Design an enzyme around this catalytic site. Structure first.
Site, PDB file in Angstrom:
ATOM      1  CB  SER A  27      -0.930   0.012   1.211  1.00 35.04           C
ATOM      2  OG  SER A  27      -1.521   1.285   1.376  1.00 35.04           O
ATOM      3  NE  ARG A  28       1.776   2.527  -5.817  1.00 35.93           N
ATOM      4  CZ  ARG A  28       1.509   1.311  -6.268  1.00 35.93           C
ATOM      5  NH1 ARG A  28       2.231   0.265  -5.906  1.00 35.93           N
ATOM      6  NH2 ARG A  28       0.489   1.138  -7.104  1.00 35.93           N
ATOM      7  CB  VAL A  29      -1.899   5.436   1.121  1.00 36.74           C
ATOM      8  CG1 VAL A  29      -2.303   6.430   2.188  1.00 36.74           C
ATOM      9  CG2 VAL A  29      -2.490   5.827  -0.219  1.00 36.74           C
TER      10      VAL A  29
END
Ligand SMILES: Nc1ncnc2c1ncn2[C@@H]1O[C@H](COP(=O)(O)OP(=O)(O)OP(=O)(O)O)[C@@H](O)[C@H]1O
Ligand SMILES: [Mg+2]
Lengths: 49, 57, 114, 29, 232, 221, 117, 50, 100, 114
Positions: free
Chosen positions: I26-28
Site C-alpha cells: 500500500s503506497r499510502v
C-alpha cells in the site's frame, strides 16, 4: 660442520650479489618504464595540441 | 666422559650441518625474495609515477 | 575506472560478481540445500545475502513505508562498506542487521540491537 | 497492556538378525 | 510463462551438473571406502583367529559371552549417514532399526538408542525417542578411534549406570556395488560357535578378556567402514 | 522481405578477386537480443546470413568474463584461414581446453578427488579464462596476443595464481615490448612463432617469473 | 628368517622379513627368532617393538596396546596404532608422556621408548 | 580485432561477416570500437594492403 | 495505490485472507493508519517479506544461525497472528493490540 | 531387420550398444581416469575405441590431399569386419591401425606396417 659454515657464508654472499644484480636490473626496468610512459604522455599531449 | 662428549657433539654437529644447509638455502631464498619484491615494488612505483605524469600532462 | 576511480569500480564489479554467483546458486540452494555447496561458494552466498540487504536503504521518501526516517550515505562510505563486505569484515554480523540501515554506523547500531 | 499480557500468559494453557560369535575350534562344550 | 519455463530449465541444468558431479565423486569415494574395507580385513582375520584359539583355551565365562538372566534393556547402535543425497540409505537403516525395536519389544526388551550420523538423530528426535549417546561427523571417513569410542561406550553400557542386557548394531552391509542391505547384528552377548578341530602369556583367561573388547571394537570399525561404503 | 533487407546489405561485405583489386569489406553487424533470445526473428535471420557469431552474454559479463564472448556457442565459419600461422598453432588447443574447463567446472570443489589430468585441465582452464579477459579500449596487437595465448596454452601460467594471471600477462608483455621486442618483431614480420623465437620467449618468461610478485605474496617459478 | 608382519587395525603397516623381534608383553619381556613355538601375548600399554631387519638397521616401533602372535609361518603384531621411530615427533611424545590421560600418557611413553629416550 | 577471445576462438578474416550478438549492455559497441582502434597500427604503415 | 495480491497457494496453506506479503503493498502506507497501528506495525510487511524469503532459503539448511532461527519463529507467529476467519472483523483497537 | 539383412541389423545394434556404453564411460574416464574402470569396462573401452576409429575411412575426397586412393568397402565386408570387431577378434592391434582404412585387407596391411 666446517663445510656447512663456509657454504652458508658463501650462500649469504651470493644472495647479496644476486640482490645487487636484481636491484640494478630493477632500476634499469624502472628507467625503461618511466621513459616509455613519459614518451606516451608526450605523444598524448602532442595529439591533444 | 670425552668419548661421550665427542659422540654427542658429533651428533649435534651433524645436526648443525643438516640444519645449516637448510638455513643457508632458506636465507638465500628469503634474501632473493626480498630483493625481487623490492624490484617489483620499484617497477610498480615507476608505473604509478608514469600514470601520474601522463595524467598531469 | 576512468571516471568513478579504480576503487569504486573494483568494489562495484566485485559486488556484481558476488550477486551473479548468488543468482546462479539460488537454483541449487532451493533443492540440494546450502550444505551441499562448496565452502567458498557457501561463504560467497553468505556474503551475497548481506550485500543484497545492504543495498536496501531507508529513503526519506519512504518514511511512510517503514516509519523510520531516511538516511544519506556518502559515496566514500558506500565504497568502504561494500569493500569490507565483499572482503569479509562483516560475515560475523547477522544478515538482518543489514536491512534498511544506510551506513556503517547504522550497521553497528542495528547489529548491537540484534 | 504488557502487564496484562504477562499475567494472562501466566494462566494461559498451551496445547503442547545375524549374531556375532566366537568360534571355539573344538567340537563339544 | 515462458520466462518461468526458461528459468526452471536453467535451474534444472545447474542441478543436473551438480548431481552428475556428485555421482562421479561418489563413484570415486566408493572405490576409496571399499579399499579401506579391504585394508582392515587382515587385522580382522588375525584377531578372529587368535580369538578362536584363546576361546579354545579359555573358560568362556566372560560377561560378553553369557546372556543376562533377565534382559531388561537392549542397546541399539544405528549407523546412519551425516549428509543427505544418499537415497533411501538412511530410510532403510532406520526402517530396519524400527523393525528391530518391534522385535525387541515382542521379546520384552526395552531398546535404548546409540546413534551414529546426524540424519538418524533427526529421525529419532522427531519421534521423541531419546538417544543416550550420539557420534557424528565421521560416517564418510571413519577412523578406528571413532569405532574404539563407540565400542567402549557400548561395552560399558553392557557391563553396567542403568546399563543394557544386550546390544545390537544396525548398519548398511555392502554386499555388492549394486546392492546394499540394512542388517542388524547382535554384537553382544556373542554366541560360542563350537566347530570340529599354542601358548598364552599371561594365562588365556586374562588375555581373552583383554582381547574380546578389542574384537568388539574391530567389528564396530568394520561395520562403520562398510556403512560408509554403502553410503557412498 | 526483412530478411532480404539484411541479406542485400551483408552480402556487399565480400573479398574481391585479384581481377577487381583484391579489396575487401568486413561486416560486423551488432544485434541486441532481448533476454538472450537468439531465436527471435531478426537474430535468426542475421545468424543465418552471417559467417560467424560472437555471442555476448550478460551472465558472463557479470562473472567478470568481459569482453564476454560465450566461447563454445560462439563460432566463426572462416576458421583458421582468418588467422596468422602463429595464432593458428598457438590457439589450436585453446578451444578444447576451454570446453574441457566448462565441462569440469562442476568439480571445482572436489579437486582432490579428480584425476591428475582432470585437475590439471581445470587449473589450465581457469587461467585461460582469466587470459581471455581484456580491458576496454585497449586492443592488443597480434604479436602480443600470440605471446599471451602462448603463455596459457603452453602452460607457463600454470604456476601463476589465477587472480594474478591478468597482471602476469600484462606485465610480461610490457617487459617483452620494452626489452625483448625481437620476439614481437619476428612474429609480426614472419607471421609465425619460430623455434628460436619460441626458446627466447620461454627464457624471458622464466626470467620474468623470478621477478614477479604474486598478489598473495607467494613466488612463481 | 622370520616372516614379521605388523598389521594395524586400519591397514597393514609393515611386512618385511626379520631375524629377531623384541617386545615387552604384559607378562614380561620377550624375544622371537625363527621357529619359535606358537604364542599369543598382549604388549604392555606403553610397549615398543624392535625388529632386527636382516638387511638394514633395526626398526624401532612405538605400538599402542597391540597384541603379539607367533605362528609357524609368520610373526604378527596386531596394532591399534603404531609409528616407526623415524615418524615420531620427539617434542610431542615428551609432552604427551606427562599427560594426565592414561591412554595418551601411555602412548607418549611408548613413543619415547621407541625413539630411544 | 585486438580482442584475444575473438582473434583466438572466432577469428574474423577481412571479407567475412561476423555478428556481434547479445543483450543490452553486454560489450558489443566496446568490441567494435576496439576493433576499429586496433587498425591504427595498420593505418600508420601506409600500405593499402594492410 | 496498492495491491492486496491474494494467492491460491497461500489460501490453501491456511494463510487466510491469502495476502502475499511480498507482492502486496500500500503506497499510502502509514498515512492511512492510526498512529498506534503505524507504530505497532511499522515494518511488519517488510519483516514478513523477509521471513518468507528466509523460509524459502532456509528450507533445507541444518545449520541456521540463532538470529535466523529467531527470525523464522517471529515470522511464523506473525503469520499465525494475521490469519483471520471470514466475517470476523476486528476493531482497530483490537487489531493494534493483536499486532502488538 | 527387414530392409537390411538380419545380420546387418544385429551387427549395427551391437556396434551402437558398444559405442553408447563407451560414451557413458567417457565421463568416468575424463574425471576419474581410465584405471578406475573395471576389467570388463576397460575391455569394452578398448573395443569401442577400435570400433569408432574403424568407422573412419580413407575418403575419395582425401585423395587430393594424400594420394591414397579412396576405398569402397562392400557392405558384406563391412558387416563381417564389424562383427569381428565387436567380438574382440581385433582388440590386440594398436588403435592407430584402424585409422582411415577400408576393410579387413587394409586393416591387416596397416597392422603389419606398424
Ligand atoms: N572488456 C570490457 N571491460 C570492461 N568493461 C567493459 C568491457 N566491454 C564493455 N565494458 C563496459 O560495459 C558497458 C557496456 O558497454 P557497451 O557500451 O559497449 O555495450 P553495448 O553492448 O554496445 O550496449 P548498448 O546497447 O548500451 O549500446 C560499458 O560500461 C562499457 O564500458
Ligand atoms: Mg552499443
Amino acid at each position: 660442520l666446517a663445510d656447512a659454515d663456509a657454504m652458508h657464508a658463501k650462500a649469504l654472499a651470493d644472495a647479496k650479489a644476486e640482490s645487487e644484480k636484481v636491484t640494478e636490473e630493477a632500476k634499469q626496468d624502472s628507467e625503461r618504464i618511466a621513459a616509455q610512459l613519459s614518451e606516451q604522455a608526450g605523444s598524448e599531449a602532442e595529439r591533444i595540441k | 666422559a670425552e668419548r661421550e662428549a665427542m659422540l654427542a657433539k658429533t651428533a649435534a654437529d651433524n645436526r648443525k650441518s643438516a640444519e645449516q644447509v637448510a638455513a643457508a638455502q632458506a636465507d638465500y631464498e628469503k634474501e632473493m625474495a626480498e630483493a625481487r619484491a623490492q624490484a617489483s615494488a620499484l617497477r610498480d612505483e615507476a608505473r604509478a609515477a608514469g600514470r601520474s605524469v601522463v595524467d598531469e600532462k | 575506472p576512468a571516471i568513478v576511480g579504480d576503487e569504486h569500480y573494483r568494489v562495484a564489479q566485485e559486488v556484481i560478481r558476488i550477486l551473479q554467483r548468488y543468482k546462479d546458486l539460488q537454483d541449487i540452494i532451493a533443492i540440494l540445500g546450502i550444505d551441499e555447496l562448496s565452502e567458498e561458494d557457501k561463504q560467497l552466498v553468505n556474503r551475497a545475502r548481506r550485500i543484497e540487504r545492504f543495498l536496501s536503504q531507508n529513503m526519506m521518501a519512504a518514511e511512510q513505508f517503514t516509519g523510520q526516517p531516511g538516511s544519506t550515505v556518502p559515496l566514500k562510505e558506500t565504497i568502504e562498506a561494500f569493500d569490507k563486505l565483499t572482503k569479509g569484515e562483516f560475515d560475523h554480523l547477522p544478515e538482518q542487521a543489514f536491512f534498511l540501515i544506510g551506513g556503517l554506523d547504522d550497521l553497528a547500531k542495528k547489529a548491537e540491537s540484534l | 497492556l504488557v502487564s496484562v499480557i504477562n499475567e494472562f500468559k501466566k494462566g494461559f494453557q498451551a496445547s503442547d538378525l545375524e549374531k556375532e560369535s566366537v568360534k571355539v575350534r573344538k567340537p563339544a562344550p | 510463462t515462458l520466462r518461468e519455463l526458461r528459468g526452471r530449465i536453467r535451474s534444472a541444468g545447474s542441478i543436473k551438473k551438480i548431481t552428475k558431479a556428485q555421482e562421479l565423486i561418489a563413484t570415486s569415494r566408493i572405490a576409496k571406502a571399499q579399499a579401506r574395507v579391504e585394508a582392515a580385513r587382515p587385522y580382522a582375520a588375525e584377531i578372529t583367529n587368535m580369538l578362536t584359539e584363546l576361546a579354545g583355551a579359555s573358560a568362556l565365562d566372560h560377561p560378553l559371552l553369557v546372556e543376562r538372566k533377565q534382559p531388561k534393556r537392549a542397546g541399539v547402535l544405528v549407523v546412519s549417514s551425516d549428509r543427505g543425497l544418499c537415497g533411501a540409505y538412511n530410510a532403510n537403516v532406520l526402517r530396519r532399526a524400527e523393525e528391530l525395536f518391534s522385535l525387541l519389544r515382542d521379546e520384552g526388551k526395552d531398546p535404548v538408542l546409540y546413534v551414529v550420523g546426524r540424519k538418524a538423530l533427526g529421525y529419532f528426535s522427531f519421534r521423541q525417542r531419546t538417544v543416550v549417546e550420539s557420534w557424528t561427523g565421521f560416517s564418510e571417513r571413519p577412523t578406528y578411534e571413532n569405532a574404539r569410542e563407540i565400542a567402549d561406550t557400548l561395552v560399558n553400557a553392557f557391563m553396567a549406570i542403568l546399563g543394557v542386557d544386550e546390544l545390537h548394531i544396525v548398519f548398511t552391509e555392502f554386499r555388492s556395488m549394486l546392492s546394499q542391505t540394512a542388517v542388524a547384528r547382535r554384537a553382544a552377548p556373542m554366541e560360542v560357535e563350537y566347530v570340529g578341530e599354542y601358548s598364552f602369556e599371561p594365562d588365556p583367561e586374562t588375555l581373552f578378556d583383554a582381547l574380546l573388547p578389542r574384537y568388539i571394537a574391530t567389528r564396530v570399525y568394520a561395520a562403520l567402514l562398510e556403512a560408509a561404503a554403502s553410503e557412498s | 522481405d526483412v530478411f532480404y533487407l539484411h541479406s542485400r546489405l551483408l552480402e556487399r561485405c565480400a573479398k574481391l578477386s585479384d581481377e577487381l583489386g583484391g579489396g575487401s569489406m568486413t561486416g560486423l553487424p551488432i544485434i541486441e537480443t532481448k533476454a538472450n533470445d537468439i531465436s527471435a526473428f531478426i537474430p535468426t535471420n542475421v545468424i543465418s546470413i552471417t559467417d560467424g557469431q560472437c555471442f555476448l552474454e550478460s551472465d558472463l559479463f557479470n562473472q567478470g568474463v568481459r569482453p564476454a564472448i560465450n566461447v563454445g556457442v560462439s563460432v566463426s565459419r572462416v576458421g583458421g584461414a582468418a588467422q596468422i600461422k602463429a595464432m593458428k598453432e598457438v590457439a589450436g588447443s585453446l578451444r578444447l581446453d576451454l570446453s574441457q574447463y566448462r565441462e569440469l567446472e562442476a568439480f571445482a570443489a572436489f579437486a582432490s578427488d579428480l584425476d591428475a589430468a582432470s585437475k590439471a585441465q581445470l587449473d589450465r582452464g581457469a587461467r585461460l579464462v582469466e587470459l581471455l579477459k581484456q580491458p576496454q579500449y585497449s586492443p592488443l596487437a597480434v604479436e602480443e596476443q600470440v605471446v599471451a595465448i602462448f603463455l596459457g596454452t603452453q602452460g607457463h601460467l600454470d604456476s601463476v595464481p589465477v587472480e594474478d594471471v591478468q597482471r602476469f600477462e600484462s606485465e610480461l608483455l610490457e617487459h617483452v615490448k620494452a626489452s625483448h621486442s625481437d620476439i614481437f618483431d619476428g612474429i609480426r614480420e614472419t607471421k609465425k612463432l619460430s623455434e628460436e623465437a619460441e626458446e627466447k620467449l620461454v627464457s624471458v618468461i622464466n626470467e620474468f617469473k623470478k621477478g614477479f610478485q604474486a598478489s598473495d605474496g607467494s613466488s612463481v617459478v | 628368517d622370520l616372516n614379521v608382519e605388523i598389521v594395524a587395525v586400519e591397514r597393514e603397516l609393515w611386512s618385511g622379513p626379520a631375524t629377531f623381534v623384541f617386545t615387552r608383553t604384559t607378562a614380561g619381556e620377550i624375544g622371537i627368532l625363527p621357529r619359535h613355538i606358537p604364542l599369543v601375548a598382549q604388549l604392555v600399554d606403553d610397549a615398543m617393538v624392535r625388529v632386527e631387519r636382516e638387511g638394514e638397521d633395526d626398526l624401532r616401533i612405538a605400538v599402542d596396546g597391540g597384541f603379539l602372535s607367533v605362528t609357524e609361518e609368520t610373526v604378527r603384531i596386531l596394532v591399534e596404532n603404531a609409528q616407526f621411530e623415524s615418524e615420531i615427533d620427539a617434542d610431542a611424545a615428551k609432552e604427551d608422556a606427562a599427560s594426565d590421560d592414561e591412554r595418551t600418557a601411555a602412548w607418549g611413553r611408548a613413543r619415547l621408548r621407541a625413539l630411544g629416550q | 580485432t585486438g580482442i584475444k577471445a575473438i582473434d583466438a576462438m572466432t577469428p574474423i578474416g577481412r571479407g567475412q561477416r561476423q555478428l556481434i550478438i547479445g543483450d543490452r549492455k553486454t560489450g558489443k559497441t566496446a568490441v567494435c570500437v576496439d576493433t576499429i582502434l586496433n587498425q591504427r597500427e595498420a593505418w600508420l604503415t601506409g600500405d593499402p594492403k594492410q
